[PDB]
Write a protein that binds this DNA or RNA. Structure first.
Lengths: 51, 459, 50, 50, 48
DNA sequence: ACTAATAGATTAGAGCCGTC
RNA sequence: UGACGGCUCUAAUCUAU
């Protein structure tokens, strides 16, 4: 089931906005994955996004 | 039939660009502008002045909900709001035992005992500052309610309240000490005889904990918030003629001017002292060349030019014999708009409907050189007036000089949010008068310090 | 600095949410569009999410 | 001196842990990644390293 | 010539090694502080 | 000469509260 | 001093018999 909110954003800069947004989004109760916060280490970086 | 002109309320900037209007919620969702890695908590007090912090200090890390978050909002916690580490680590418990306190408290001469009680505290603080290894950013003197219950109204002219002498004696040391109290920090365990505590701080344990956290935040070099409308190259001066009726000679009445500049670096400073008391709250022309020059010397070297406009606020109007000296010291390039602000004029309007005051931001202009600004009153942000009746709208007059009164009205409505002592929507009088007053209460108590323009943190 | 003629072609056909001039319309229209689109969410946080 | 374009095929797709700019943040991200993946571990003890 | 043993110096989490450089590089300091505020002055070139 | 003189005009501590 | 109100109690000062 499609549940995570995809924040497609630039890795170095827009994450800081997302560390405001996503952290607030977690605070609002929204499910969030990001290429910085919820991205698990040691995965296929291109393929994990496709999944 | 008369109308009330309105001006919009300016807003206040926060972390990474975002600009809200309320300091209450613009800080929770964003955080302070300048992030600091951590604050070391130094605490000194009696036996009961430590377990209270061991309750409170880590209590504001976790979110605490009041009765209602609409009127008394909760805060997620110190780490989640202020973006800093402030916990039970770096604690500098320096026990001043009650018998040690009692051996100095038992003296009955309040002219001597009250100085003695502070002398017990400062000697430890400066010793730890110099002759010790531990580092403290903001010191938490938890004086019990009994200490300031009795000590309330060359080194004894200070007031019966030890507030002034304690902070005035650290000007040589320049350590920022947050004076605390057991009642303000131990609301839960304090109980009266009948079973209902006098201080009902439970509901305020939101925005009250905002005050304590933000007061301890700014004193550590941080920037909890900054104004988002203060103009460029403009200086906002304010002098409150504070009484020096502390020593035996009442001949001294020295003002403590201060400035809040464009870059957010409000360098509150010391005015000039001289024999002008006759009870007149004015300073002689010779000393005027030393106040505004020191005010402008502290800025012309900082930026490289003269200020654009000097909003010299005061609760007292300026006579010609005082303002004439201001002319030669200042350059003509700046218009010294002396905004004599009065809160005693009897103007009070009520609304035919609604149980609240007039919406803030209204500016009932009287003429080109007078106005009435409702910097205190009803608001649309917290939907609650910061008063019980409609107050005196701050009588704003260009006492000397010529300028647009409308440009004056907005800035007073701007010098009301940067209250780095509380967490309110805004203040009723400009901070250029409140912070200019805390210097006078602290500094003018003692007459043996040639102090630099220390910011409010040391006071 | 997002000039309308320089934005991505897929972006312009969609109503962008404004964060520049204020965060106000930023997270609000993010949630306001979510409210109108029935995006799944859990509970309402503590204090009715303040 | 080893550019990110000279990484061998066995780990090209694998999200690497950065250490070039600073070894401290790489060590921390090592810790958080193991905690998120529930990697088996004992209590922290540097005497074993000593 | 009786030999006097080399002493010890403590480090983070109460541990005990013998080299100031080696212990800190692997163990760390005893007290836990968060950050260091560096008031820095000098000439314009010296800033670089 | 100033000796008082009762007011307007503005002031601020300074207790007393509440601390919507 | 957690704070920003609100008046209230007293006193002081200069414009003028």
């Amino acid at each position: 089931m499609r549940n995570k909110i995809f924040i497609s954003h630039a890795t170095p800069d827009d994450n800081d906005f997302t560390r405001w947004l996503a952290l607030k989004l977690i605070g609002l109760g929204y499910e969030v994955w990001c290429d910085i916060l919820f991205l698990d280490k040691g995965v296929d970086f291109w393929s994990n996004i496709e999944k | 039939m008369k109308e009330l002109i309105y001006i919009e309320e300016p807003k206040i900037l926060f972390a990474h660009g975002q600009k809200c209007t309320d300091a209450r919620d613009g800080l929770a969702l964003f955080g302070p502008l300048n992030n600091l890695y951590g604050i070391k908590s130094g605490v000194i007090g009696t036996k009961q002045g430590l377990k209270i912090f061991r309750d409170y200090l880590d209590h504001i890390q976790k979110p605490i909900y009041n009765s209602n978050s609409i009127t008394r909002p909760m805060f997620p916690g110190f780490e989640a709001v202020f973006d800093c580490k402030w916990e039970s680590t770096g604690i500098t418990f320096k026990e001043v035992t009650n018998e040690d306190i009692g051996k100095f408290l038992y003296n009955s001469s309040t002219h001597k005992r009250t100085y003695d009680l502070v002398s017990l505290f400062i000697d430890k603080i400066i010793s730890a500052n110099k002759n010790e290894d531990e580092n403290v950013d903001v010191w938490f003197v938890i004086v019990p309610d009994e200490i300031y219950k009795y000590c309330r109204p060359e080194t004894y002219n200070y007031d019966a309240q030890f507030h002034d002498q304690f902070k005035a004696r650290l000007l040589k040391h320049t350590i920022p000490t947050q004076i605390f109290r057991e009642s303000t920090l131990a609301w839960r365990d304090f109980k009266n005889a009948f079973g209902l505590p006098i201080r009902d701080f439970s509901k305020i344990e939101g925005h009250l904990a905002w005050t304590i956290s933000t007061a301890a935040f700014y004193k550590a070099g941080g920037k909890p918030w900054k104004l988002s409308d203060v103009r460029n190259g403009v200086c906002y001066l304010g002098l409150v003629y504070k009484k020096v009726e502390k020593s035996k000679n009442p001949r001294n009445a020295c003002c403590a001017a201060q400035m809040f500049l464009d870059n957010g670096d409000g360098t509150v400073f010391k005015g000039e002292v001289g024999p002008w008391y006759n009870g007149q709250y004015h300073l002689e022309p010779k000393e005027a060349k030393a106040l505004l020059s020191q005010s402008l010397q502290s800025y012309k070297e900082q930026i490289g030019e003269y200020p654009k406009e000097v909003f010299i606020h005061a609760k007292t109007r300026f006579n010609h014999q005082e303002w004439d000296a201001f002319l030669e010291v200042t350059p003509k390039e700046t218009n010294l708009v002396g905004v004599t602000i009065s809160k005693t004029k009897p103007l009070k309007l009520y609304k035919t409907e609604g149980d609240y005051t007039i919406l803030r931001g209204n500016a009932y202009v009287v003429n080109e050189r007078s106005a009435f600004l409702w910097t205190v009153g009803y608001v649309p942000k917290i939907q609650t007036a910061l008063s019980m009746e409609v107050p005196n709208p701050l009588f704003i007059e260009i006492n000397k000089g010529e300028a647009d009164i409308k440009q004056v009205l907005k800035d007073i409505l701007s010098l009301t949010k940067l209250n780095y002592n509380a967490c309110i929507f805004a203040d009723g009088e400009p901070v250029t008068l409140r912070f200019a007053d805390k210097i006078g209460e602290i500094l003018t108590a003692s007459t043996d310090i040639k102090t630099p323009p220390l910011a409010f943190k040391y006071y | 600095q997002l000039s309308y003629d320089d934005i991505n072609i897929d972006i312009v056909r969609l109503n962008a949410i404004d964060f520049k001039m204020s965060w106000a319309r930023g997270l609000k229209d993010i949630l306001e569009a979510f409210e109108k689109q029935k995006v799944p969410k859990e509970v309402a946080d503590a204090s009715k999410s303040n």
